Amino acid sequence: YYFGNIKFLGNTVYSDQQLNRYLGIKKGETYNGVLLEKRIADNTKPDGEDITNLYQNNGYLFSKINAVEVKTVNDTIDFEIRITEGPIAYFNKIYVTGNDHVIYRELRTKPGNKYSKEELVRTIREIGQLGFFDPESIKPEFRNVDPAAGTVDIEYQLVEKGSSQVELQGGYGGGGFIGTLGLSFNNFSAPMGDGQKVALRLQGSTYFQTYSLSFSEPWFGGKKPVQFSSSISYSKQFNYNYSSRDVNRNQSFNIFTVQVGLAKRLDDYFVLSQSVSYQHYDLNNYYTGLFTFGNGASRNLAYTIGLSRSNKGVNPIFPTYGSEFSISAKVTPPYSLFNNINYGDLQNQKEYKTQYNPGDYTKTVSVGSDYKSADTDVGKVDQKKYNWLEYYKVKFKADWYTKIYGKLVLRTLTEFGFLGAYDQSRGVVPFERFYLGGDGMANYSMDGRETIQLRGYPNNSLTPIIEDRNSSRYGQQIGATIYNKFSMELRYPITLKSSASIYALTFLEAGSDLNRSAGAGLRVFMPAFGLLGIDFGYGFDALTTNKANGWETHFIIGQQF
Template structure:
């Protein structure tokens, strides 16, 4: 006869995820302290899970020994509850001799089989689904329901819907096992706006100044579209503190808010009444420095910038000690940290207040200088370590300087291989006694290669473009088959290939750049090749047919070699660059307005020298601070000074022939001689300045200038290297050295003559706002004001005679495709040959520089 089995309920019932209880009742079979062998495990109550999966999850094994009381059983309950899959867990035990048999009784949480959101527009539902993790199969817990409701209520209150109500109901889905359907009903109600704000008790500061200090809570005003009058309680509390800060800036350190009232009006608006007590105005008295040995009082006073007798400004005092809003601020804390004193501590202490004067002590604990111990980088899966470490301004054994950490962040951002928004320096293991600190740079790789694949119709035919740009290329692994993914990458080199073709032309280009030639210093070597074949259109009996005549063609071939080096003086933001370029132009029965001859050739051997300074950043796609400027000169050899040709006589002969209309062959012969070797000089300047404004806005200010000149007026200006102003500024297939200057609001190249201008200037203001600066895509909006003009002769140049425009635009940068954008510009002035404002123009931007 089978022995009698005695079942004992341990009453192991978990009521909440954060707590559980185990109840054990002694009897004459299970004894405290006795060890049993686990003879078997059964699982009951399952509806959607596999029994063996649950047994494996518990970690219990048949044959293992279990003593009572048992921590193993408690651990099993904790683990099962921790998965958020079960609402109740009970464990039953039965013994048979020295064996114990367990039964785990589970109550599964229901799964979400379907959900529905009502009360809002469909386009708003996607964000809610994403943010609340609403999805089929989600286990429906009480905490999930509460968190979802709280999130939605807060979301709409933050948008000004203070009366928003959210109801979430569930019902059993009879078509599926252990499943529920969910209905989310959202009643936003009307948006609650601030009708008026009444300030009481203020005499020293006007209502206008106090209301301006309230950054987020504004009165209803139909002309203020950039800041709505919605009421958000958290923002309102913050603005009350802002009022006190505004008084503190003006010297009223005892100012306080006695009371504030929120009045609900019948039209569902709010009226705010704020009662302030201003107190007396105070002034700075004596400011003494205590504990400073590294810097003199005089030096610290200059940095502090506050003198005895100045109006008391508590906000300014805190910023001059340590400005939390600007990591690179000119304050006393940064003064010490930029000199290695990481462990320094600076505090302003009020020591006396006599009448209206407050005396302070600036108490400084300098500590000992800190030096970098370990400097590491994490997150670079594709970029080789040496490419990163050569950009670091923080090296082991060097003195700690905060400015070097900030500069390192900028340099890593400028590489373009990492997401600039996520680069983070982690200060680790600071040891004040040893005077050492570690720093670890966290990086997230992003796509650094770009593909340009375009097709369109223009110029009488289809135009196709294929461009490949690899900005983290590795030339040394070019023969390493294992390194191809799809190309060898990781050494920070640039490789670009581009092909564009239509019925009328083909253009090919190749470029390569090594930013650290030799590997010891930032010395960039670059080389590029290009070739274009342009065909003429055919005519039949004097009529244009629109077909291609391949027997008449214009070939342009070129090569360029450049070398650029980072300088140390005046500072290491400067670069000095040099390049040598050669272009060969070959006409074969091809007539163009650039030449008077249809058969012949022209050569251009030019040397370009430039000086630039680039300190903008840290994000190269969306710079917020710093500036960029460059000045360059492109020159050829002055052949006319040494070739022995009487250019004055040739010019006179040519002018006479043109005037008489005779001997076109002789004119072509003279022009072939003039342009056999091009002779010119070209000077350019460009500058951009970036200023961070409140609310994430960035102001970009720009100026440009260009001039093309000749050494010998009798020989004349060359037909190449000219400026074409107007439009989107996008480069086209022509490789004749021309430069397309963006000036939105006007058609492309419409502000220059047909053959291009020899001098231009341009001024611009651009206000930018970041919509998102994520790794997958960076998007920002902009509004702009521009003015510029082009002239055919220097004597006509007038820098104030501008063609003006304004407009708005959008930029989207995706690592794989580069920059995409659209601008809508309005030209306020007339194009030459018209007598009215140009009006609206739409410009598309693809792959243009930032």
């Protein structure tokens, strides 16, 4: 038996040709009733490319697709698919029962809008992401369905399950584990009420521990989605050698941070983000790298601005069309112009020379009381230079996705980053510097360090090192002030279900004339176990002999960008 002459009757919204293209059944193939029903209506999944959802996604909710067998001759079966459309569906009144303005503000199914199952699914997902209600019983149920007037009413059945939440999360990056414990009350008001979130969180890795209190208002003013965030945090960070994964427990600094910030949506794809941050770095025996003021303290007052454009594909895990652009500028007040002290002649002043005959100056050999002699104490000069941090920072990121051929997707990434000082005599600050190479890790550390991902190379291997030889600090990393990366990845998916999202990828990266890397990897995303990615990368360039680094492997958990 074989199919024959699938004909579509009584459909006027779509032509015969488009629906035939959507059916994908050709004459002469072997009859498969299961296949016919699956193509007609894949009831197993809500996002299937089936005809019933094709009609139901644009609002012809009363459309019914049934099959009637007309003739079976010459071992060939003929059909006439019948479509009965009905009028378009418009929402009239949308109400929620079982809980008010907090829920209503986050509804995608507004009154007067054309019916779309995608909107109902999105509202379900958003109410679930709010967290107060039981995720398994967010039930949209239809009332006052009047096909006579073409209207529909929706009631959302919900069950309360508490506002508070506890969270234990984990990840891996930089060759080290990371984990957070968080207690988050998702309703604070001015207590029960508005959607203001207040969370107490603690994050830890092998070399840094952070404690934080974070308040966040998602709808500032109650009209438009303006996020107002505030965070008071205290962190302790060790000297960590990312290459060898050992830690020194006697070289550590404490960062006390207070940040206020605001994000608002402007076109309409743009987001403008602003922040004001105060950070106090209390050092303890941190004589590592470019630091010589290991027993002092520094203060950092920063204003950060950022413009972002995002229109990526439907799945955040696996986009298939769009672009993302990000420009960020961090500025500190220019104290150099207003402070009338000279930073080039500091080394020739009596208050900055080495002292101990008691009170004499030393070059250690006593050199008398000649104030021009002795050694310019680097600790005191650097402490006076950096008691208030002075720097300007610019970051630019571009991420363009495209489809090439079939189900393949190509992702192109390009970042530039610069940091500088207003007065060149003041010098580039040792903090907020760019560290390049390895598994890559987000800004979990609050000192401004940004670990840039370049697979195929050890963690933090390409960051510049002291090259003075006789400086007694050869081999320690000091940080990069300018960095550029270009990445190009090809990705093929195996599953795009809600439960699991798996895809394989091949990557070519060039990071800094650059160092190049090539490799392949596999990523698996699940809501429970997270985003687990395994990458194997061969680097063609060296980290004395001009021999390539060769192979390396990374295993990461979480979005380590």
